[PDB]
């Protein structure tokens, strides 16, 4: 009958930054404490052992400390590779993992890069046209797609998916995809992909005439 | 040299039992511990149980006590966690790992994780995907890219050239289209110098229906 | 010459802390764990935790958890157990136990059995305050007897600490002697019984007196333990 | 945890004889068994580890056997000095390393019943608050009786005390002794006191009693 408190629940920092997580347990667990990085879409790495056994190949940035039911993992000075969630571990009363700390980073406004592709002569034969529009390297994550379909909006036919932020540069991309029938995409020639951002001027439109 | 492998990914119906492996290399398995830790998507990692392979010792936690069995085939080197009586909450990423021993500081850590394996609690059936090419209509870059459309269930890995070509790759999250069947994009930026002078092909593998398709980009 | 040398005996009222001591010497004790045992009086033995003498790790067991405080002096080979807010049930011999081989134990390591330990510290929890027995006569009578044998004892009521050493006519008195052990009743207060078996025929003659000495309050008890005397006699 | 049960609780055993100890487990301990020797006032001496092996310095008649859940301890020659209490200690799971109860090997003898004796409360202590009236069992065979306390027909519940002496070193016996501990007018209340003894050495429980007067 143990608990634990993982504070905060996400935060945001800039490159250079001091990141500080701390960890609180409802009785002593003797400084079975350890402290595990987890990136996205990658498994649980561990980064301390026992309060502060830095593991080795892990850089010297990142340091725990504490004792009784309170302890704190540090990083000095965050980089763009440390984007992940964390999570403190109590190993003396059976084990228990952290709700974990998402850590994002604060970046300079970065607008995207634009592209267009149109449907695959293998997709149409099977009837279904899909359009993608992609938005490549931005900052902030927030970003408009307006699909124009001979200048006219669409709506209900859209989809789109965002990655998670980058490891290298700690931007976004985004990837909108508009969906019609053979039919209807024979019905039309300019097909556009208008992106608005905070990084941009003017919005962007890309576009192609079908043939 | 030290290795966690695990198991695919698995589509199971409600109801019924998965079991998922564990194979350790580069170390004795009877010299460290292997945990069960498991973890639905944006959600805390929660630990389910631990196995000494040695003497076969079992310590789970109480809520997945009874539902949960570990078990260890030490000869193979590997170890198994079966879960009955599943349910939709049960979907999550299944993970095991090792609990090795510390010279210089007398003490155990949880120090290497398995990739992970996914156990899908679904009736729906398995539909592998269709690969098509994104490529420009007729700039100093260029972007290229593939259609991973109408598969289900998750997941699918993209890689380009091979994995020779991974600096400037955005593999996407899927969506969900009304058919109940994922669509995910995977691109790639190079230089429009090149487009002629190099061959792009995404290598799609969708393993639950057997699925590898290696589609060339032009 | 391998032995661990353990600190004295303890009294400690409710709510109070003890810190008993462990001594080694005939090996190296960094290379070592270090245990913690005990045992209530008339129970089986408990294992508390240990300590990894060589790096200071620790591991205790979850009854104790919260009060139980396990240290190490690498200067002095010494290993210490510390037991916080003691309660009447915390009355046990700690014994320091150094189990046969070296390093941790794990899969493919089970090393905790230990051949290694130390005489034994008792540690009594007791609000009670040193007070010397109050002696009473277990007197003999036909009621007493069997087979030309009678019994005969010293009630030895509501003394402490422990122990009191018990004789009989000043050491001249020792066969068909029984003292039996002592005591602790809800007062806190230790009680005992000393009973003799002697002739049933010579009780008119002989002269039977327990002596009862109790060092802690400096209190010597000389009782006469005469046969069974009657404030009246009667009829129907 | 692992509760390490010890049977029988205690072993009648005479010299010279095999003594068979036994040690179970409520779940699987492998060969992950040790033996203790503990005499009164003394630290336990590690006799047998992994179940079977013996530790250095132990001399061979002492052996040892099993795996899983049920253990046994062996002294095919049983001498002077191995009367003691063994015990039976796991070390496949930890927190918490656990122990059994315990069994002591007694010398055994003839089934010698108790003789059985009821002390009334001194006019001493009488005159003071509290009121003690003991029982006396002494040179009895075996060491398991049960003494029950009755006042005016009525049952004793925890209102007394009881303690046993260590097997006599020339004829072997036990002895024991229970006290009924009351206070005026609790012992001022009540006529007959008496103690009833339950004992294999004879026919039907021995009952010893007084009136107050």
């Known amino acids: 009958?143990?608990?634990?408190?993982?504070?905060?629940?996400?935060?945001?920092?800039?490159?250079?930054?001091?990141?500080?997580?701390?960890?609180?347990?409802?009785?002593?667990?003797?400084?079975?404490?350890?402290?595990?990085?987890?990136?996205?879409?990658?498994?649980?790495?561990?980064?301390?052992?026992?309060?502060?056994?830095?593991?080795?190949?892990?850089?010297?940035?990142?340091?725990?400390?504490?004792?009784?039911?309170?302890?704190?993992?540090?990083?000095?000075?965050?980089?763009?590779?440390?984007?992940?969630?964390?999570?403190?571990?109590?190993?003396?009363?059976?084990?228990?993992?952290?709700?974990?700390?998402?850590?994002?980073?604060?970046?300079?406004?970065?607008?995207?890069?634009?592209?267009?592709?149109?449907?695959?002569?293998?997709?149409?034969?099977?009837?279904?046209?899909?359009?993608?529009?992609?938005?490549?390297?931005?900052?902030?994550?927030?970003?408009?797609?307006?699909?124009?379909?001979?200048?006219?909006?669409?709506?209900?036919?859209?989809?789109?998916?965002?990655?998670?932020?980058?490891?290298?540069?700690?931007?976004?991309?985004?990837?909108?995809?508009?969906?019609?029938?053979?039919?209807?995409?024979?019905?039309?020639?300019?097909?556009?992909?208008?992106?608005?951002?905070?990084?941009?001027?003017?919005?962007?439109?890309?576009?192609?005439?079908?043939? | 040299?030290?290795?966690?492998?695990?198991?695919?990914?698995?589509?199971?119906?409600?109801?019924?039992?998965?079991?998922?492996?564990?194979?350790?290399?580069?170390?004795?398995?009877?010299?460290?511990?292997?945990?069960?830790?498991?973890?639905?998507?944006?959600?805390?990692?929660?630990?389910?149980?631990?196995?000494?392979?040695?003497?076969?010792?079992?310590?789970?936690?109480?809520?997945?006590?009874?539902?949960?069995?570990?078990?260890?085939?030490?000869?193979?080197?590997?170890?198994?966690?079966?879960?009955?009586?599943?349910?939709?909450?049960?979907?999550?990423?299944?993970?095991?790992?090792?609990?090795?021993?510390?010279?210089?500081?007398?003490?155990?850590?949880?120090?290497?994780?398995?990739?992970?394996?996914?156990?899908?609690?679904?009736?729906?059936?398995?539909?592998?995907?269709?690969?098509?090419?994104?490529?420009?209509?007729?700039?100093?870059?260029?972007?290229?890219?593939?259609?991973?459309?109408?598969?289900?269930?998750?997941?699918?890995?993209?890689?380009?050239?091979?994995?020779?070509?991974?600096?400037?790759?955005?593999?996407?999250?899927?969506?969900?289209?009304?058919?109940?069947?994922?669509?995910?994009?995977?691109?790639?930026?190079?230089?429009?110098?090149?487009?002629?002078?190099?061959?792009?092909?995404?290598?799609?593998?969708?393993?639950?229906?057997?699925?590898?398709?290696?589609?060339?980009?032009? | 010459q391998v032995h661990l040398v353990q600190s004295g005996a303890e009294v400690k009222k409710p709510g109070a802390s003890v810190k008993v001591s462990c001594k080694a010497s005939?090996?190296?004790?960094?290379?070592?764990?270090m245990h913690w045992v005990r045992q209530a009086p008339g129970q089986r033995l408990e294992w508390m935790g240990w300590i990894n003498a060589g790096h200071g790790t620790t591991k205790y067991s979850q009854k104790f958890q919260g009060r139980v405080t396990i240290t190490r002096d690498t200067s002095a080979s010494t290993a210490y157990m510390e037991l916080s807010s003691l309660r009447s049930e915390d009355t046990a011999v700690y014994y320091c136990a150094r189990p046969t081989s070296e390093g941790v134990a794990g899969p493919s390591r089970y090393y905790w059995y230990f051949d290694l330990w130390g005489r034994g510290t008792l540690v009594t929890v007791s609000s009670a305050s040193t007070k010397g027995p109050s002696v009473f006569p277990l007197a003999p009578s036909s009621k007493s007897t069997s087979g030309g044998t009678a019994a005969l004892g010293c009630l030895v009521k509501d003394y402490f600490p422990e122990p009191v050493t018990v004789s009989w006519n000043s050491g001249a008195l020792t066969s068909g002697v029984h003292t039996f052990p002592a005591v602790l009743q809800s007062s806190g207060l230790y009680s005992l019984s000393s009973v003799v078996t002697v002739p049933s025929s010579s009780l008119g003659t002989q002269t039977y007196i327990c002596n009862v000495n109790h060092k802690p309050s400096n209190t010597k008890v000389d009782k006469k333990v005469e046969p069974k005397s009657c404030d009246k006699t009667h009829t129907e | 945890e692992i509760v390490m049960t010890q049977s029988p609780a205690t072993l009648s055993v005479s010299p010279g004889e095999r003594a068979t100890l036994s040690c179970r487990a409520s779940?699987?301990?492998?060969?992950?068994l040790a033996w203790y020797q503990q005499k009164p006032g003394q630290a336990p001496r590690l006799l047998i580890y992994?179940?079977?092996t013996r530790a250095t310095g132990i001399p061979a008649r002492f052996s040892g056997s099993g795996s899983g859940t049920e253990f046994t301890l062996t002294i095919s020659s049983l001498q002077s000095e191995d009367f003691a209490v063994y015990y039976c200690?796991?070390?496949?799971?930890?927190?918490?390393?656990?122990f059994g109860g315990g069994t002591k090997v007694e010398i055994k003898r003839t089934v010698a019943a108790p003789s059985v004796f009821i002390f009334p409360p001194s006019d001493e202590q009488l005159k003071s608050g509290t009121a003690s009236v003991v029982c006396l069992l002494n040179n009895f065979y075996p060491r398991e009786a049960k003494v029950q306390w009755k006042v005016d027909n009525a049952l004793q519940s925890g209102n007394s005390q009881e303690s046993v002496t260590e097997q006599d070193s020339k004829d072997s016996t036990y002895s024991l002794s229970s006290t009924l501990t009351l206070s005026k007018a609790d012992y001022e209340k009540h006529k007959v006191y008496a103690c009833e003894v339950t004992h294999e050495g004879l026919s039907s429980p021995v009952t010893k009693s007084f009136n107050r007067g």
């Open positions: 005939g090996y190296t004790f960094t290379s070592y764990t």
């Open positions: 200690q796991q070390y496949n799971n930890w927190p918490p390393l656990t």
């Open positions: 992994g179940a079977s």
């Open positions: 779940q699987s301990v492998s060969s992950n």
